[PDB]
């Protein structure tokens, strides 16, 4: 009985830690995604204008 209680407590703690780590990873990944999106839009608009005023 003591071992079963210990096992359930251990699972609860481990899954809590895993959830917190996943949330932090999601936050950092979203930041990187937004940076990449902005950089893309900048690159296409600059290429468009360079081609346009090259004429």
């Amino acid at each position: 009985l003591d071992a079963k209680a210990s096992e359930h407590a251990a699972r609860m703690t481990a899954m809590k830690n895993a959830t917190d780590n996943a949330n932090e990873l999601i936050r950092t990944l979203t930041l990187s995604y937004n940076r990449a999106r902005q950089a893309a839009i900048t690159q296409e608009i600059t290429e468009i204008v360079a081609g346009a005023n090259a004429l």
Partner: protein, 470 residues
């Protein structure tokens, strides 16, 4: 000499040629009024704003309405001044467009009325107030957890069904009732259906007589959608400066102002900036925001709804907008569903005014204690859902007991809700709010039922409501 002639038309962009030595200045307003000379022409009534001097006595302008039917060579009249709109008592209770013409069917303003230019420099350094002052709104949650600043800018966040319009109407009513200040609503990029609904709601509520409304509708050109905010600001500045009042200015969505700026820049052919925005993004935002300040004789405070593109707070438009904000109010659909009708999120909303230097030590301590209690209650939600209330410890039960009462006491009965509920509204001073929340935190009312805190004003009304129930 003030006569020019159209030489180029390319969509909303018009080029006009003037006589040498008589060019109009930048931001001047030009008028085209033409009567159909024959069957192959149409009537024209159009306004243009000067943008650039191209040389060779030609001016590039942006149109305030549709350019269909224009012909090269027709006469253009220079007014000698920027766009000018009526100001004063005459604007209260009326609906205007960007040009200052009444959009409602109540009749037009007489030509002898005073009109002020839309474009002007910001107030000078020595004309500004030297000390920060709190603006008391009479709303408990706003006054406690996110105080407003006279002359400050407040960002408003929320969805559609969360009561933004009701909050705006209550702010207008309370400010007019207790401080004697008018309000101005600036509908930048307003949908026509929603504008009609808002006009009818304000007329029903009765706050229409204390407010002036300016609508720049979505189907209007980018120049008009860009200048609507400035014409509303000009309307408010008269009451700040001449009457010495404290005035509220509402901007329907400032992101649409930035987007209209981007569209105008693209039309004029300037090189795009970082994410496709105009090069002058920060300069335009500053020229708008720096005129909303507190002076030695009055102030203008602004509530601004903000749209965040792709939920990216790092995006240049929100990043530039947040550089001017002093407070933030968040509306929560979860609270709206729970029945907290002010619906202001108590933990997400923030304010730079919540500091003991300006708000007071007792106020600061009470606010921090309230926020801490609500954060702990927020944490306990999962364990309450899993194991139930009975499995919690005694101090957790005490925390829940205090927190539910605090959450209910953050609600309030609004004056503008009387037409629906039958209950009169309340105006609660910040001192009463602080004292009531301190008493709740001290456990002076642990024995009262939680429903007694639902929709009341001062703390004594909780006792009266509990006594009335039993």
């Amino acid at each position: 000499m003030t006569r020019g002639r159209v030489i180029q038309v390319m969509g909303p962009v018009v080029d006009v040629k003037f006589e040498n030595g008589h060019l109009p200045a930048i931001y001047n307003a030009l008028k085209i009024q033409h009567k159909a000379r024959n069957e192959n022409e149409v009537d024209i009534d159009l306004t243009l704003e000067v943008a650039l001097h191209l040389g060779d006595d030609t001016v590039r302008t942006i149109a305030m309405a549709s350019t269909d039917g224009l012909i090269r060579g027709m006469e253009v009249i220079d007014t000698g001044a920027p766009i000018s709109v009526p100001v004063g008592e005459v604007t209260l209770g009326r609906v205007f467009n960007v040009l200052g013409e009444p959009i409602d069917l109540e009749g037009d303003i007489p030509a002898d009325a005073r009109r002020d230019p839309i474009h002007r420099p910001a107030p000078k350094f020595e004309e500004l107030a030297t000390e920060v002052e709190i603006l008391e709104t009479g709303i408990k949650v706003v006054d406690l957890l996110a105080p407003y600043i006279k002359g400050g800018k407040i960002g408003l966040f929320g969805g559609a069904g969360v009561g933004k319009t009701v909050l705006i109407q209550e702010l207008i009513h309370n400010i007019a009732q207790e401080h004697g200040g008018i309000s101005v609503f600036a509908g930048v990029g307003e949908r026509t259906r929603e504008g009609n609904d808002l006009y009818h709601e304000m007329k029903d509520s009765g706050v229409i007589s204390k407010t002036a409304m300016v609508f720049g509708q979505m189907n209007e050109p980018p120049g008009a959608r860009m200048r609507v905010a400035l014409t509303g600001l000009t309307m408010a500045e008269y009451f700040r400066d001449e009457q010495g009042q404290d005035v509220l200015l509402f901007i329907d969505n400032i992101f649409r102002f930035t987007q209209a700026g981007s569209e105008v820049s693209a039309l004029l052919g300037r090189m795009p900036s970082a994410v496709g925005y105009q090069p002058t993004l920060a300069t335009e935002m500053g020229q708008l925001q720096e005129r909303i300040t507190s002076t030695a004789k009055g102030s203008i405070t602004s509530i601004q709804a903000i749209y965040v593109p792709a939920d990216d707070y790092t995006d240049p438009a929100p990043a530039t907008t947040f550089s001017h904000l002093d407070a933030t109010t968040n509306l929560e659909r979860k609270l709206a569903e729970m029945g907290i009708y002010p619906a202001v999120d108590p933990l997400a909303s923030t304010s730079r005014a919540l500091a003991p230097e300006i708000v007071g030590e007792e106020h600061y301590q009470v606010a921090r204690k309230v926020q801490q209690t609500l954060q702990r209650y927020k944490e306990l939600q999962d364990i309450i859902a899993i194991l139930g209330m009975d499995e919690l410890s005694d101090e957790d039960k005490l925390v829940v007991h205090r927190a539910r009462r605090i959450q209910f006491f953050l609600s309030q009965n609004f004056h503008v809700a009387e037409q629906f509920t039958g209950q009169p509204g309340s105006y609660v001073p910040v001192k009463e709010t602080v004292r009531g929340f301190k008493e709740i935190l001290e456990g002076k009312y642990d024995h009262l039922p939680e429903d007694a805190f639902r929709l009341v004003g001062r703390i004594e009304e909780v006792v009266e409501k509990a006594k009335a129930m039993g």
